[PDB]
Amino acid sequence: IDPFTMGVITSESEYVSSLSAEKLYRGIVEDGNIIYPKALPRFIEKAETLEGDGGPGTIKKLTFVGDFGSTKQHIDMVDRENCAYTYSVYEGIALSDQPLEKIVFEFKLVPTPEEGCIVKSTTKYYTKGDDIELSKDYLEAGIERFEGFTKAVESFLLANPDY
Amino acid sequence: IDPFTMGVITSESEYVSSLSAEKLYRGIVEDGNIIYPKALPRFIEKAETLEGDGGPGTIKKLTFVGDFGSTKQHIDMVDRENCAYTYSVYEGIALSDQPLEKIVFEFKLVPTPEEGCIVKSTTKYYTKGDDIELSKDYLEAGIERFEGFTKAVESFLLANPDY
Ligand SMILES: CC(C)=CCNc1ncnc2[nH]cnc12
Ligand SMILES: CC(C)=CCNc1ncnc2[nH]cnc12
Ligand code: NA
Ligand code: NA
Ligand code: NA
Ligand code: NA
Ligand code: NA
Ligand code: NA
Ligand code: NA
Ligand code: NA
Ligand code: NA
Ligand code: NA
Ligand code: NA
Ligand code: NA
Numbered sequence: 001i002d003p004f005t006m007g008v009i010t011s012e013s014e015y016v017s018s019l020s021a022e023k024l025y026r027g028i029v030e031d032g033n034i035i036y037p038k039a040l041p042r043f044i045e046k047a048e049t050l051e052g053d054g055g056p057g058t059i060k061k062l063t064f065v066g067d068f069g070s071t072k073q074h075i076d077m078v079d080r081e082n083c084a085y086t087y088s089v090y091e092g093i094a095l096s097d098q099p100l101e102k103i104v105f106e107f108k109l110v111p112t113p114e115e116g117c118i119v120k121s122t123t124k125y126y127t128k129g130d131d132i133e134l135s136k137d138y139l140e141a142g143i144e145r146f147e148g149f150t151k152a153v154e155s156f157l158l159a160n161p162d163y
Numbered sequence: 164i165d166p167f168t169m170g171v172i173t174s175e176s177e178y179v180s181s182l183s184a185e186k187l188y189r190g191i192v193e194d195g196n197i198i199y200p201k202a203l204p205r206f207i208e209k210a211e212t213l214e215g216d217g218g219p220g221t222i223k224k225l226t227f228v229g230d231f232g233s234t235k236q237h238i239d240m241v242d243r244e245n246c247a248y249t250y251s252v253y254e255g256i257a258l259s260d261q262p263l264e265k266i267v268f269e270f271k272l273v274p275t276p277e278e279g280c281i282v283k284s285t286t287k288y289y290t291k292g293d294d295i296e297l298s299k300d301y302l303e304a305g306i307e308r309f310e311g312f313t314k315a316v317e318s319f320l321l322a323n324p325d326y
Contacts, residue, residue: 042304045259065304067255067266069232092230096208103230141205141228 006101007127009134011143014120019154021109021117025083027157028150030054035163036062039156040149043068054078060087076104083109083117095138099128105146119154121147169264170290172297174306177283182317184272184280188246190320191313193217198326199225202319203312206231217241223250239267246272246280258301262291268309282317284310 017024027035036047045065050072052058058075069092077086086106093100104124109117123142125134157163180187190198199210208228213235215221221238232255240249249269256263267287272280286305288297320326 041300042307045301064231065258065301066308067232067234067252068227069230069255071230089230092232095228137204138208138228144205145229 005130007125007132009125009127009139011123011125011139012121013143013147014118015147015151016112016114017109017116017119017154019116019158021083021111023157024117024119024150024154025080025085025109027153027163029078029080029085031163032060035153035156036149038160038163039152041065073105077106095125095134098133098138101126101128103142105142107146107150119147119150121150168293170288170295172288172290172302174286174288174302175284176306176310177281178310178314179275179277180272180279180282180317182279182321184246184274186320187280187282187313187317188243188248188272190316190326192241192243192248194326195223198316198319199312201323201326202315204228236268240269258288258297261296261301264289264291266305268305270309270313282310282313284313 033047033049036044043065044062046063048061050059050061052075054075055078056075060073060075061070062073063070071089071092073087073089075087077084079085084107086104089103089105093103104122104126106122106124108120110120111117121143123146125139125142127134196210196212199207206228207225209226211224213222213224215238217238218241219238223236223238224233225236226233234252234255236250236252238250240247242248247270249267252266252268256266267289269285269287271283273283274280284306286309288302288305290297
């Protein structure tokens with residue numbers, strides 16, 4: 001029958017940050033070039049803007065410390081008002097024998113009266129090909145890394161409010 | 164005057180393992196292809212031998228989960244009798260604006276009466292060029308990752324003696 005087939009696999013994780021939405025958002029989205037290497041000094045070597053002004057359509061690049069390469073982030077949505085940010089990664093994303101078309105990363109930070117904010121993180125894996133095999137470890141890996149970056153930045157900013 | 168100049172920067176870390184030298188060594192060196200992905204399921208996707216039989220001269224490759232590339236390990240010394248292992252990495256190793264010729268990784272596991280063994284880890288950074296600038300974070304990074312792999316494997320093997 002020869003159908004066109006695609007899988008979109010969504011993983012969602014939340015946690016409560018002590019840092020306010022606005023500060024966490026500014027740290028990652030506006031000051032990432034400075035803060036990513038300060039928050040993860042032994043993993044992220046450099047974060048820079050390759051193309052664009054910071055909004056939708058911007059291409060950023062993270063360079064990792066040591067023999068772990070580098071990756072471009074293709075910015076898709078930037079919503080300061082609602083502390084929402086989305087970007088895609090297109091290269092070097094095959095998960096074992098499962099090719100992918102893209103991985104999409106999205107967060108939305110929601111102010112909460114008790115603490116700082118609720119950090120709502122999503123990763124979406126878009127599959128290439130006619131079938132699908134993704135283990136729990138690989139699906140969890142993307143969302144753990146992504147939320148891990150956010151937690152590192154939160155922790156840094158709480159310890160050094162000077163940024 | 165035009166001298167030939169090279170830096171060799173050595174970082175050394177030790178800790179006491181509960182697992183015996185022989186088992187930790189076998190796990191990493193002989194059964195790495197199986198154990199590395201079990202010990203670090205969300206970071207190391209695959210560990211395979213590309214060339215050789217496992218001894219000196221063998222080339223192994225680690226593939227990392229997600230957009231973090233892959234790296235070849237060029238095996239230099241394999242000493243089962245003394246639980247010693249050395250390998251080099253040659254590619255993708257520039258540390259910021261400091262090019263490197265190679266990074267060498269070495270461990271020696273020494274049986275200890277109280278616990279299992281003393282894990283003696285070393286990383287050596289060989290610099291390319293006429294001057295040198297390496298921050299504490301980058302020097303610490305290599306040895307933390309390396310010792311981190313060993314600790315992950317130790318922990319896995321203690322929880323699953325079936326390997
Ligand atoms: C599958 C997996 C472990 C993905 C992790 N990669 C990433 N996770 C979060 N943000 C990123 N930017 C570039 N690469 C990124
Ligand atoms: C500088 C740094 C963070 C190095 C870490 N890289 C590695 N550390 C330990 N073993 C390895 N095998 C291949 N690459 C390896
Ligand atoms: Na940190
Ligand atoms: Na690097
Ligand atoms: Na790259
Ligand atoms: Na990459
Ligand atoms: Na709040
Ligand atoms: Na398809
Ligand atoms: Na583990
Ligand atoms: Na990969
Ligand atoms: Na590679
Ligand atoms: Na690599
Ligand atoms: Na012992
Ligand atoms: Na030189």
